[PDB]
Amino acid sequence: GSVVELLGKSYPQDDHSNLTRKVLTRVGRNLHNQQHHPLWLIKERVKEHFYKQYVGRFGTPLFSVYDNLSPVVTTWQNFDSLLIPADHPSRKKGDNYYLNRTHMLRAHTSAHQWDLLHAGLDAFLVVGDVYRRDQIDSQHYPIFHQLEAVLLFSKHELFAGIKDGESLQLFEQSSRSAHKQETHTMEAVKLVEFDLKQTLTRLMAHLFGDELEIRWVDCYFPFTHPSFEMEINFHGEWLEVLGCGVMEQQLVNSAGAQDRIGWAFGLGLERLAMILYDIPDIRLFWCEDERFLKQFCVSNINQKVKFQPLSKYPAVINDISFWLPSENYAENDFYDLVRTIGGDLVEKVDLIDKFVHPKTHKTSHCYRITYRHMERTLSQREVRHIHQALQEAAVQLLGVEGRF
Ligand SMILES: N[C@@H](Cc1ccccc1)C(=O)O
């Protein structure tokens, strides 16, 4: 219709609006605040590291923790506050859940960094549900959870370890390099980067034990420089679990935190939980199967959980092919439709073939859908009927022409 009502507020619909009822109905579910949920367990262990295991020169900073911020944010909060350019590909309608042109469900917990800095906070964690439009497989879900951490330092704290530290400065006017921002001194950046990497290495040792294999990968974000991803070697592959870096000075200065340099990080809770607990499919976080959920009810949050694998059920594979409409088709629109109709019956969707017809000039797409339930065997009848409903919905709602 013309308006969406969410959390007591009204959003007029426009050309950017792309929310689905299934996604909207999970706003407020807050799995990260559900006692004994694995995502809540990871949040509680990370909070304990900051409460008891982080120490600086001036003692432990008191990190305040915000786990109940509304996910409805403006484009300015999600993008402009973090220096994301207007033409950046992360803003595309295909990849984000937009209530309208002005409001969206946050795609990251970094959407709250400016506001919390603007409130005068120098040490904080944000934990919350985040929303992205993407592909369907065992590692991707429309809703996932992140833990954000921000720590700011004055020159007095950063240089407290040396007698003439008061003569050193956070800022200078030089040039941006791979190692630093144009207005940062190398003296400050090396100390901030070291504290960021040391804190994260220690936290991973406090979540996983002492035999973990991690590596730092240099990368880019518009809101940090220098920036890194931490990867964990798991099942023979290097997997990214977080993004981090030295906060861009324009962001810190814009929020009113003058004379501070900071580090920031964003952890993917499902990515970490899937490695820490050997959870094979991200749909298990949303299931109500006691075989999965009972395993995370522990008396001490430091108990090493040894998750017991669930039985794996057979799959039913079906292909769906259709001619795309002349304009405006996006693969994410089809993936959203599969999530709406197929739901948690669908393990993955792969685009396996595309071609252009010589006479009509139309593009054909062929998608392979793997139906596999996490809790039971699927009947051939339920998959056949659901697959047919998906074909009808694609023609009616996406304007495709069936090749069926
Ligand atoms: N917001 C980034 C992670 C990040 C957070 C903080 C600093 C740098 C990177 C993401 O979602 O990938």
CA distances from 219 to 159, 224, 228, 272, 338 (A): 27, 10, 5, 19, 33
Same domain as 311, residue 282: no
Same domain as 61, residue 12: yes
Using DSSP, state whether 151 is helix, strand or coil.
strand
Question: For a substitution probing ligand 1, which of 82, 110, 223 has the most ligand atoms within 8 Å of its CB?
Answer: 110
CA distances from 404 to 16, 193, 219, 381, 392 (A): 31, 55, 43, 18, 10
Centre of ligand 1 to C-alpha 146, Å, is 9
Same domain as 34, residue 169: yes
Whether 391 lines ligand 1, by a CB cut-off of 6 Å, is no
Q: Which of 247, 274, 306 is the last residue of a domain?
A: 306
Same domain as 341, residue 300: no
Same domain as 266, residue 157: yes
User: Using CA positions, which residue lies closest to atom 6 of ligand 1?
Assistant: 265
The structure tokens listed for 245 are 């870096």
Same domain as 336, residue 282: no
- Where are the extended beta strands (E) located within 91-223? 103-105, 123-131, 143-153, 214-221
Q: Which of 285, 306, 327 is the last residue of a domain?
A: 306
Same domain as 154, residue 69: yes
DSSP state string for 222-241: TTEEEEEEEEEEETTEEEEE
Whether 79 lines ligand 1, by a CB cut-off of 6 Å, is no
Same domain as 251, residue 116: yes
> Which distant-in-sequence residues (6+ apart) come within 8 Å of 178 by Cβ?
218, 226
Same domain as 350, residue 312: yes
Question: For a substitution probing ligand 1, which of 117, 125, 216, 223 has the most ligand atoms within 8 Å of its CB?
Answer: 223
d(CA 351, CA 356) in angstroms, rounded, equals: 15
Technique behind this structure? X-ray
The structure tokens listed for 247 are 């906060």
Q: Which of 306, 335, 353 is the last residue of a domain?
A: 306
Same domain as 314, residue 288: no
The size of the chain, in residues, is: 404
Q: Which helix or strand (DSSP H or E) is residue 352 part of?
A: strand 346-356
Whether 100 lines ligand 1, by a CB cut-off of 6 Å, is no
Count of domains observed in the chain: 2
**At how many Å resolution was this determined?**
1.5
Same domain as 274, residue 174: yes
Contact 129, 26 (CB under 8 A): yes
Whether 221 lines ligand 1, by a CB cut-off of 6 Å, is yes
d(CA 50, CA 44) in angstroms, rounded, equals: 10
Residue range of the domain that includes 9: 1-306
